[PDB]
Design a binder for this molecule. Sequence first.
Ligand SMILES: CCCCCCCCCCCCCCCCCC(=O)OC[C@H](COP(=O)([O-])OCC(O)COP(=O)([O-])OC[C@@H](COC(=O)CCCCCCCCCCCCCCCCC)OC(=O)CCCCCCCCCCCCCCCCC)OC(=O)CCCCCCCCCCCCCCCCC
Ligand SMILES: CCCCCCCCCCCCCCCCCC(=O)O[C@@H](COC(=O)CCCCCCCCCCCCCCC)COP(=O)(O)OCC[N+](C)(C)C
Ligand SMILES: CCCCCCCCCCCCCCCCCC(=O)O[C@@H](COC(=O)CCCCCCCCCCCCCCC)COP(=O)(O)OCC[N+](C)(C)C
Ligand SMILES: CCCCCCCCCCCCCCCCCCCC(=O)O[C@H](COC(=O)CCCCCCCCCCCCCC)COP(=O)(O)OCCN
Ligand SMILES: CCCCCCCCCCCCCCCCCCCC(=O)O[C@H](COC(=O)CCCCCCCCCCCCCC)COP(=O)(O)OCCN
Ligand SMILES: CCCCCCCCCCCCCCCCCCCC(=O)O[C@H](COC(=O)CCCCCCCCCCCCCC)COP(=O)(O)OCCN
Ligand SMILES: CCCCCCCCCCCCCCCCCCCC(=O)O[C@H](COC(=O)CCCCCCCCCCCCCC)COP(=O)(O)OCCN
Ligand SMILES: CCCCCCCCCCCCCCCCCCCC(=O)O[C@H](COC(=O)CCCCCCCCCCCCCC)COP(=O)(O)OCCN
Lengths: 205, 438, 111, 82, 120, 97, 127, 58, 187, 77
Amino acid sequence: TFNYVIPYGGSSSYTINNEPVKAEEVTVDFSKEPSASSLKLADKSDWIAYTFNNVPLMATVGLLAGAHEAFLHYERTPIYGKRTYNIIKKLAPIVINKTAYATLLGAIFCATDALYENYSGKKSYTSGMVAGAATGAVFAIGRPLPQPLVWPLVFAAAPVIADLFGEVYPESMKSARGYGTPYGFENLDDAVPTRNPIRRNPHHY
Amino acid sequence: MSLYLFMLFLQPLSLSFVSRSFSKISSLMMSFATLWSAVYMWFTSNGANQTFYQVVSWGSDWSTFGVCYTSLYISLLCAFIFPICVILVQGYRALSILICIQTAVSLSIVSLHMLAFYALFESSLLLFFILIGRRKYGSLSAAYNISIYTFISALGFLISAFWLNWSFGSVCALLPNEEANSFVAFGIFILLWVKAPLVPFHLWLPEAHVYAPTAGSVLLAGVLLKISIVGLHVFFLPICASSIVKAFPLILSICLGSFIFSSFSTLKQIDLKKIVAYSSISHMAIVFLSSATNSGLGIQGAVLYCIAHGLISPGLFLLVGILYKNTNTKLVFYLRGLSQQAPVWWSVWVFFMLGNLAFPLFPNFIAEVVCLSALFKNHELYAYAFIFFSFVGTVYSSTVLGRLKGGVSSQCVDASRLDVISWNPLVLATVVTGIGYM
Amino acid sequence: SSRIAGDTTGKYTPNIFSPETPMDRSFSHVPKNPFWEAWVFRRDNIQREFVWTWQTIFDLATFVGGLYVAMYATASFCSRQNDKRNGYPERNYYFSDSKSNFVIPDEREFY
Amino acid sequence: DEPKHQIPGNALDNWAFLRTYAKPLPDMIHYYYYVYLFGFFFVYKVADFPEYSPRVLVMAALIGSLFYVRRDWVHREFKDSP
Amino acid sequence: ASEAVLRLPHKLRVMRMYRTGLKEIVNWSYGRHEFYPRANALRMEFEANKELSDREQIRKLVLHGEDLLARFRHWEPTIRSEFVGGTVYGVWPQHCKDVKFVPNPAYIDEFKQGDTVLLY
Amino acid sequence: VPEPPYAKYLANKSHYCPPDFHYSREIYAPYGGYFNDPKGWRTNTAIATLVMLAGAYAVFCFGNAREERLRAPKGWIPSQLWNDNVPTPVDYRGKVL
Amino acid sequence: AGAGGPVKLSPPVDKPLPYNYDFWMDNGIYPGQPIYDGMFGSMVGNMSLEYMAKGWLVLLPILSAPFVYEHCIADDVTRNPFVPRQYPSEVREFLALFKNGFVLNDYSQPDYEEMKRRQSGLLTPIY
Amino acid sequence: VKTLADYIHWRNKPSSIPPVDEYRPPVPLVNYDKLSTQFFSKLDNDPVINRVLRAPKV
Amino acid sequence: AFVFSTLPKLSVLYLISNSNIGSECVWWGLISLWLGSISQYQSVFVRSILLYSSVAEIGLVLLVLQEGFSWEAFSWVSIYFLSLSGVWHANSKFVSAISVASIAGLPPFLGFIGKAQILKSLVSINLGILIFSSILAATISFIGYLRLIRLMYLVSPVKWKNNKDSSFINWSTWMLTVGTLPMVYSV
Amino acid sequence: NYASLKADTSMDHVFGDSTNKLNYDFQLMSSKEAFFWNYTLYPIVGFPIFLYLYQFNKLENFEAEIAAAKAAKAASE
Ligand SMILES: CCCCCCCCCCCCCCCCCC(=O)OC[C@H](COP(=O)([O-])OCC(O)COP(=O)([O-])OC[C@@H](COC(=O)CCCCCCCCCCCCCCCCC)OC(=O)CCCCCCCCCCCCCCCCC)OC(=O)CCCCCCCCCCCCCCCCC
Ligand SMILES: CCCCCCCCCCCCCCCCCC(=O)O[C@@H](COC(=O)CCCCCCCCCCCCCCC)COP(=O)(O)OCC[N+](C)(C)C
Ligand SMILES: CCCCCCCCCCCCCCCCCC(=O)O[C@@H](COC(=O)CCCCCCCCCCCCCCC)COP(=O)(O)OCC[N+](C)(C)C
Ligand SMILES: CCCCCCCCCCCCCCCCCCCC(=O)O[C@H](COC(=O)CCCCCCCCCCCCCC)COP(=O)(O)OCCN
Ligand SMILES: CCCCCCCCCCCCCCCCCCCC(=O)O[C@H](COC(=O)CCCCCCCCCCCCCC)COP(=O)(O)OCCN
Ligand SMILES: CCCCCCCCCCCCCCCCCCCC(=O)O[C@H](COC(=O)CCCCCCCCCCCCCC)COP(=O)(O)OCCN
Ligand SMILES: CCCCCCCCCCCCCCCCCCCC(=O)O[C@H](COC(=O)CCCCCCCCCCCCCC)COP(=O)(O)OCCN
Ligand SMILES: CCCCCCCCCCCCCCCCCCCC(=O)O[C@H](COC(=O)CCCCCCCCCCCCCC)COP(=O)(O)OCCN
């Protein structure tokens, strides 16, 4: 509008609808559909099965963190000096405890997520926030005063970010194309394509 | 329009060829000539052309420049207040920095391309980092604060502009586009949230004002805060109205919370520049909320109240800078007896403080009446909330005035002839707008 | 012990070698107090003395978050009343879960 | 004289804490060699990993960030002891 | 009783009680005519107990009189105007000499007045 | 302390100034000094009075041009002497005057 | 003498200042004051807030006794020995419009009920 | 389990401790300053007060 | 360091684009971005700052190149060569300041165009996590670049060697300042 | 340089000494008291809000009861 008299923007009639028209005559897709393994892992019906499918990620991360710390210790120990203590007896607790505590946190997260979704019956932000809150509460059992508040908040915030930018964001902008005519505006005279552009093939790595 | 843009480009150009001893005089003449070119742009802007008074393009979508109601008011305001900044600042380095900042800011206001707006507005990022972090009287922390806040908000705005350019094919305002996406709406919104100081993203403004020079503070308060409303009327409301109407309860929550907590934070200030800087934050919320109603009253009232703020807060900052030159202190507790010691400075200080409290014979009154009327058009409680908590401003303004007014002092600290020349235009403009020539 | 620095005639020169102290702009500078300076330093750097206590969390929540919650509730109530007043269908606000798509009224339509 | 920040702790105790960073420093190639090798093999194995939900991926990243120990932390606290 | 009154010696404490009592007689009166009989009555009230030597009874009398003088403090003390708490105290305080006045301020380095940006 | 040279340009203490009261004579205030009574005050007052009456004449013209009486006065009013837009008076009964 | 009176100057600060020293207002003359008198320090008349609340507790029932009888106990028929002012029908109908009018209490009128419901009007605008 | 939580500088304790000795502003002295928290007291009708104030003939 | 941190990348980018060497995994570019930004912010030495900036940017460019945006990475590598020329061959503070501004992506110079190409390609593929990470990591890297400006003009007097061998340094600074408006069509 | 920390004792005999000090601790209200008084005064400030809430609830309840009675009358008839 760019004037001080009438409101900016505009309005669209709710009664009037515009027939969908295809962005191109022939559609060639280079985006592959979800695999059956992805649908299997995403399935939260059985909370035990959902937990056991998704924990290997957490155990892997804990193992890398423990291996990093254990190597930092091993690198320091002197080879030239013979050591009275056994190095692996020193180093194994590091890796084992890191992996175990990581797996326990991930197990709480996944189990609470699946249990809340089953009980609620709906897929929602709240399941992730509650699972994260429980995981952060387990993180800060005996920790000093700011941490009982901050860790539930951070661990709850993480699934919100994952949902917002992993699921809502892609689905909100599926229709936008960038070629031919703007998705809302097909009445405008822009070059109309026979085929959509293929900038790359379906990946296979 | 073309003359105004040419003169805006001429001012930084002249500094390269001046003798480096004639720099101040040439800069002042260039500033006044730019003001006259802005008056010419107003003359050649016909009200018959209702959508845009003037549009000029220089070969690309980025080079598309145009003036509307908001743009014309803000550009005249910056061109009006720049000469005062020029006289207040000494040295080729400082003159160069301030001229480049003003050129970038004034080109941003008239730009009609979101990407060009972003490019011109953020070109003044290091210049404030250097300016606020100057050797002896600057603070690196404040420069870091302002630079980081601006960078994050402007990068979000840039991402939204990229998405619009990909989807629509254009990001120029003159091409009608509408979007219902909330991610892009937030990307455009975050810049406004930060640039117009709105709680909790208001922390950069105080530290910047206190540790910026008086000319820098005058520009920052006068027009850089108003750049938010140019962005809102030009680049957010035309395209992102659905999201502002969807989020209106949240928008009101954040705006009224900013008003209240900024008013309360002002009460805990002992530094005069910090008092004025926090008054600015409380003043911005009414502007932001009145525009967000997307009504004829709200837009006009917001631009009017921006003009009122850009005539009142530069005056307070200028007076405080003069007092700091005379006294080498900004603490209210050190400053006493200013009524007896500086009658001429005290008169103007009281006049401008009355203006900041929105008394009838001041432009802030008319502007506030219009904004409150727009809020009342939305709902009665909306206006009632703002009207009541305006009393908090009276408490801190009255406490500051009472502390400064009387006591025992052994120093005559009153303004010189140069200082009075510096504020005379602002006083005249304040009076002229107050009687209704808004 | 003092002399007039400023010259209205324009023949001003700064006597850096003069025995007498010039009456320059620094003549009127406030003397300042040691304890006031330390009070200013303490008050600006009050983040050093910030401590997370249950009392601090209680105060912050009850006043700041409480005012935000109250303002949001009041704004939502006003929006509901305005929707009933204008005759609009219940609007799909961001955190309200409504099965209606009404957001912006059509100017052309009569409500 | 100017107002200054109070520094917690005694001067010699803080200096003694800082002196615990002066320990024999290994060269970084030893860490880098293992990271390169296991990273190459890891990238080969990742293409075979099952597709994980974005939420689980983000939680795993958070856990890894929390569990990561800075190399300086081990440096200061390392004891050649059981 | 305030701390300063308590720290005082016995003789001065009773003197303070008499002085405060007389001032409060002045404050609670409607005119000077009321003052004299009431002042004589306060005189007799102090004179009645002056010859007591039992310390404990004297402490009781002093404490009770201090409580009575605390309760009957007037909301509006009658204070001479030129003294602290008076109406004309500080109306136009006499201004001292040796004032730091800068003559011809705008003509000290007129061209080069302003703020500079110094850099490394 | 030996009075500074510029003290000669500064004016004396006025008759209305109390002898004990000391004020700094160098301070300038638009409303006047601490006790004023300048030389030539009579001529300044005459000039101020002339300006007041001239502005009163201008305001009188403006007001008479903009004074609108839409209802007839009950009786004769003094404005009839100077303004011609006064409606003819009508009394309480209704008779025109 | 109004002008030139002697004054005492407040001593300069010589000890570390409290954080909330902004609660003290000192212009340089000796008797500095709190920002709001009665917020702290000496109390006028040595009377606390509890004393004032007890005094008000004593007063309020006696002060409210005249008002409570007419407003609550009394009723329109028994408040006064006469009816409201009687007007011609054209005047009475206009005057009855005013919610803050005095003819709304005319119980003789056949529109008494509607007039009373008009008097107890809307708290807030409906639109 | 070594974690970031162990090495983050959590604000549990004040970095700066205020000085103990603090300035108390000078105030005019009220000799007897005990607070009256009782609206009804025996002190108002005390025999001394009756003899000093109410009794003497005026 | 300058010639072997810019020139080799062009051949690898061309090989990836032409021979279809792209993977579905986005972890490595994301890790490059976050690790580079955080390590740049935590690095005391100036050489490490400049070296970690390249890691972050090349991770982002790798994410863009996998999706087939060859033109934008081929422009980015050239603009990055010109931007890095001045800071690496540091002879004048002002030239280094413009170079550091260009590397940051700052609007008045050509570096803004090069970063804008990559960011514009990002919004097309519509991966939200990448965009969020890009914004935050860009802020973190901006802090390190601001450290570089602070060290030159705002910390202490600075004296450098008078190595008057600016073969293409003046031309590169001129190209960074000037070239923005001719190449604006690209973004 | 700095102002003198020595006070002036010329007027002590006229206007009293400065020995007597304030008894205030220069501390604020307790958190518990502050909670009560905020949550009491702020509602009093927002008296229009509660009036609007009361009338809106009354209007909606009356409208719903009318609707229910209308449904009852339109079911049988
Ligand atoms: C036997 C060999 C030993 C190694 C065993 C493993 C061998 C490798 C096998 C396979 C390797 C490939 C995969 C490993 C990860 C890739 C990293 C790598 O290889 O770079 C080379 C790297 C060495 O490179 P370098 O240049 O010499 O070191 C640079 C640093 O400056 C180093 O200097 P520094 O250590 O002194 O400084 C560390 C600095 C360096 O900074 C980083 O570490 C950057 C990491 C940020 C995240 C990285 C991107 C995450 C994306 C993951 C993508 C997958 C998920 C997808 C979706 C996720 C969405 C985000 O960070 C910190 O300061 C500490 C904090 C660490 C995380 C910071 C973020 C905190 C966020 C949490 C917020 C909560 C706080 C709230 C309360 C706050 C109160 C105010 O080698 C390794 O570190 C490998 C160690 C393996 C341990 C990783 C454990 C978990 C791994 C998966 C989790 C992903 C999160 C990453 C955690 C940190 C990883 C560094
Ligand atoms: C260091 C300073 C020393 C010098 C002091 C200067 C003293 C200033 C004198 C005060 C001036 C008071 C005059 C107030 C009236 C404002 C004048 C004005 O606005 O001019 C009007 C003409 O109106 C008049 O001339 C008014 C006549 C003034 C004299 C009337 C009697 C004087 C009594 C003063 C009462 C004024 C109360 C008005 C409150 C708003 C312009 O007419 P338009 O063409 O319609 O302009 C459009 C309207 N608008 C401005 C809103 C855009
Ligand atoms: C559409 C254009 C935009 C796209 C940009 C990419 C295209 C580039 C087109 C313009 C390229 C211009 C490149 C400018 C380079 C600057 C010239 C230069 O570097 O000269 C050096 C050359 O230095 C040498 O080493 C000389 C050896 C080589 C001499 C030139 C070789 C010419 C080979 C023939 C090239 C012809 C092209 C072949 C057919 C296409 C001299 O400087 P120094 O003496 O080393 O130090 C300077 C000191 N100071 C400035 C501070 C005073
Ligand atoms: C960058 C965003 C990160 C959030 C930052 C918030 C502050 C961090 C504090 C950590 C607290 C954990 C995060 C909670 C944020 C979510 C907001 C709560 C609102 C809420 O509970 O409603 C949910 C939906 O909101 C949602 O969960 C989605 C709302 C998205 C969050 C807000 C996005 C804009 C915030 C940006 C503020 C400024 C940025 C600076 C950080 C339920 O919805 P439901 O579908 O489950 O219905 C229920 C049927 N069972
Ligand atoms: C998928 C991803 C999931 C999420 C992962 C999140 C990971 C963290 C992301 C955080 C990104 C934000 C980057 C800003 C970091 C804060 C600034 C750094 C703090 C700091 O110490 O900077 C100092 C001064 O900065 C200052 O003074 C600035 C004060 C703080 C700036 C305020 C931040 C901007 C506003 C924040 C929100 C804005 C809206 C958000 C939508 C200068 O340090 P130095 O130069 O001396 O170096 C010495 C090294 N110690
Ligand atoms: C917690 C209080 C909220 C804080 C915000 C206060 C007021 C800000 C309002 C700004 C006005 C325009 C902004 C548009 C919406 C922004 C946030 C609105 C609240 C919100 O989070 O709603 C969510 C939807 O928005 C979304 O899904 C996206 C949220 C924004 C994303 C955050 C960061 C985005 C950065 C993107 C950069 C640019 C990218 C451009 C491609 C979820 O609400 P729901 O509808 O799901 O209801 C489920 C409830 N049961
Ligand atoms: C961790 C951080 C947070 C922890 C601490 C939070 C503690 C704060 C909780 C209490 C906050 C005040 C109460 C407001 C929320 C009440 C509960 C929300 C539910 C709600 O909306 O009910 C409405 C409350 O009335 C209303 O509309 C609001 C009335 C109260 C607002 C006025 C009182 C304060 C006035 C001060 C000015 C602030 C507002 C300025 C505009 C009336 O129900 P409904 O009929 O609307 O139907 C809506 C269907 N649920
Ligand atoms: C003619 C029309 C009406 C005129 C005004 C009438 C006002 C009547 C209100 C007073 C009557 C009821 C008082 C409540 C009963 C309390 C009785 C004991 C008082 C008490 O123990 O605590 C007090 C609480 O203050 C309080 O009691 C404050 C409660 C007052 C409620 C707010 C009403 C406005 C009052 C304004 C004038 C009244 C002044 C006297 C209240 C003193 O508290 P403390 O300081 O010792 O606490 C210690 C600091 N940790």
